[PDB]
Design a protein around this ligand. Structure first.
Ligand SMILES: *OP(=O)(O)OC[C@H]1O[C@@H](n2cnc3c(N)ncnc32)[C@H](O)[C@@H]1O
Length: 637
DNA sequence: GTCGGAC
DNA sequence: GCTGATGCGTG
DNA sequence: GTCCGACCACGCATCAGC
């Protein structure tokens, strides 16, 4: 009846009576908005999952076709990841559309959104148009993403304005948040799947209206219901790990049920799969705290690239995020015959694409690999060569190897694939358990221009079932242990207002090193992680009395982002980083290493405040240039 | 990519 | 046609 | 331990404004 008072977090929720729309009718967007309100209100993930599951139960019973758009709206996704749809709507475009919808000036909404750290609250504060539809709003989002070419931005603003003028109550909050990419719900992919599993299990799809069953957890005890939903949730999470595509799972799910889902949606070449991720470990003692045999392989500094070889012969390349990278690696497609034995007909490979110097026969840093083109690269115009480092086999000649331990996968990988030094090399492995040999292999990886070591079990918990544990592998880098990472002491010269969880305080900071020759502070990087919430409020207060309207004459930031609050240089912070990079924007140590480029920090994080040190006692630009030239990858050239 | 927080 | 701004996908 | 959302550098690809 009334969608304004819709409450999907009601005790003894009924998918039919407690709904706010009629069967066969389109799902209103206000129902989705009010649910986002209830989800954002609470903090327990188990409460969030059941609240959204109450939505999908009503959707799967009243409006089955609206399940797919509701799922994507809750994920703030536009579709399958290999399709590559992107909104192309920045903050400025959204704020410009907001100022045009609400009738304010751009400078009024730009300062208000930066002060609150959220565009949704700004967007909400004529004749009433028809109410917004969940599938209609999702279609408008996709219409925005598909607008390309000249004068397309003005066409995106028109659609965004068209949504905002039809919003009621809380709809403008979540449309603006979705368009900006910060839904800020506290509930993401993993909770959406678990809530989808709970919805199909409780209210099964495919029932002729009115559905004969609404709450299948009625004739169960509290213990058996939790075990039943957990078992039903793992079937969906595992199938989605091999097919992360809702456009494929939902239709099969709606016509064949959850129990029969793995029989139709199965891992196959051409369809990207979720890759195995790694868990950061402190030292080798934390590694040895895992009682089983493992292998230590180099951590190559490149990009994840899973190779898909089809039966007919077509080859597709997918990224860590299941994005299509086929047109980006034309040199890899041509090298497919030179890496497989003639008996190979189809395979899913797990490799790391690393930039390779053909003259010296040496690995190039990650910056060089990022200089390759993306959009429809011609095979001849490729300038930065790449060497593949395969470390896992997933699919081979029709048979899937997800249920096979890594020891078997490593055997069939080196057996059916042939090495080619400079283009296809297995990651150097070391299958021992001595703390002395392992500590030496880790130092050898850095000497061989690698980030560190990967640790993977060989038999005990060595499957590729990412749904059981998505961080089953361990990564051990030199900057994870204390006293070994490059520790720099830098000066805080500026601060940026925080957004989201950091709204009301500072989310980032601008750091600078001391150029002893120019008697000036040179910005080196920004800092936005490493401090606890208590420290971050302590910084926001201790530096609130240091704000300067103008920058000091001895501060140089060059192409860096102008800080929101200029800060009087006095605070000295200890910062840890994994590497030092040649920056195209930061002026720190410009001219000392490269004639035009400065130096910045890779993966910088806050450690602690240095009250003993003063700005002049901070890390000098000459020392920063010394650390860059003392890096193994730079010495190795 | 690193990281802290609430559960 | 060029250029600064910036979205976005890699890490 | 899981899940989530704060934040980082870098560089290709894109488009409003000129
Ligand atoms: O730090 P992180 O979680 O991104 O690490 C995981 C990624 O590291 C890359 N990588 C490099 N070398 C390897 C080996 N030998 N095994 C597995 N992964 C490896 C991958 O790109 C991975 O996603």
């Amino acid at each position: 009846l009334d969608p304004s008072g819709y409450n999907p977090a009601k005790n003894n929720y009924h998918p039919v009576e407690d709904a706010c729309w009629k069967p066969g009718q389109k799902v209103p967007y206000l129902a989705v908005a009010r649910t986002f309100e209830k989800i954002e209100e609470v903090s327990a993930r188990l409460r969030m999952v059941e609240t959204l599951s109450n939505l999908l139960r009503s959707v799967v019973a009243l409006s089955p076709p609206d399940l797919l758009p509701v799922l994507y709206l809750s994920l703030n996704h536009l579709g399958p990841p290999q399709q590559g749809l992107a909104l192309g709507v920045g903050d400025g475009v959204l704020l410009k559309a907001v100022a045009q919808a609400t009738g304010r000036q751009l400078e009024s909404v730009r300062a208000e959104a930066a002060e609150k750290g959220d565009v949704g609250l700004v967007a909400e504060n004529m004749l009433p148009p028809p109410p917004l539809t969940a599938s209609g709003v999702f279609s408008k989002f996709r219409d925005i993403a598909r607008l390309t070419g000249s004068a397309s931005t003005a066409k995106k603003i028109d659609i965004i304005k068209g949504l905002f003028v039809a919003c009621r109550h809380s709809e403008a909050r979540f449309i603006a948040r979705s368009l900006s990419g910060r839904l800020r719900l506290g509930l993401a992919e993993q909770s959406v799947l678990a809530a989808l599993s709970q919805a199909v299990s409780l209210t099964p799809p495919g029932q002729e209206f009115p559905p004969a069953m609404v709450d299948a957890g009625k004739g169960k005890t509290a213990e058996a219901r939790k075990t039943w939903l957990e078992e039903q949730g793992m079937i969906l999470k595992q199938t989605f790990c091999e097919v992360p595509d809702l456009d494929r799972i939902i239709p099969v799910l709606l016509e064949h049920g959850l129990e029969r889902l793995p029989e139709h949606c199965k891992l196959s070449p051409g369809i990207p799969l979720k890759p195995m991720l790694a868990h950061p470990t402190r030292g080798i003692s934390e590694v040895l705290k895992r009682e089983a045999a493992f292998t230590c392989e180099y951590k190559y500094d490149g990009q994840r690239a899973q190779i898909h070889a089809l039966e007919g012969g077509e080859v597709k390349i997918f990224s860590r995020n299941q994005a299509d990278n086929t047109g980006k690696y034309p040199d890899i497609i041509s090298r497919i015959p030179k890496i497989k034995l003639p008996s190979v007909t189809s395979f899913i490979l797990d490799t790391e694409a690393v930039a390779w110097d053909r003259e010296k026969k040496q690995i190039q840093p990650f910056q060089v690999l990022t200089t390759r083109k993306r959009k429809e690269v011609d095979a001849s115009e490729i300038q930065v060569q790449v060497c593949l480092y395969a470390f896992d086999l997933i699919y081979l000649n029709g048979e899937s190897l997800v249920r096979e331990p890594l020891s078997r996968r490593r055997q069939l990988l080196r057996e059916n694939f042939v090495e080619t030094e400079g283009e296809f090399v297995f990651a150097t492995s070391l299958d021992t358990k001595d703390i002395e040999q392992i500590a030496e292999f880790l130092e050898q990886s850095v000497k061989d221009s690698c980030e560190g070591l990967m640790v993977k079990t060989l038999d005990v918990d060595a499957t590729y079932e990412i749904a059981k544990r998505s961080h089953n592998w361990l990564k051990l880098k030199k900057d994870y242990l204390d006293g070994v990472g490059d520790t720099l002491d830098l000066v805080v010269i500026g601060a940026y207002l925080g957004r989201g969880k950091r709204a009301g305080r500072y989310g980032g900071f601008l750091l600078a090193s001391y150029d002893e020759d120019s008697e000036e502070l040179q910005a080196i990087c920004k800092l936005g992680t490493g401090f606890s919430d208590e420290e971050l409020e302590e910084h926001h207060q201790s530096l609130k009395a240091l704000v300067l309207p103008s920058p000091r004459p001895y501060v140089r930031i060059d192409g860096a982002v102008i800080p929101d609050h200029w800060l009087d240089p006095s605070a000295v912070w200890e910062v840890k980083c994994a590497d030092l990079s040649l920056s195209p924007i930061y002026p720190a140590a410009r001219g000392l290493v490269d004639s035009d480029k400065g130096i910045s920090l890779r993966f910088p994080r806050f450690i602690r405040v240095r009250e003993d040190k003063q700005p002049e006692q901070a890390t000098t630009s000459a020392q920063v240039a010394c650390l860059y030239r003392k890096q193994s990858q730079i010495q190795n050239q």
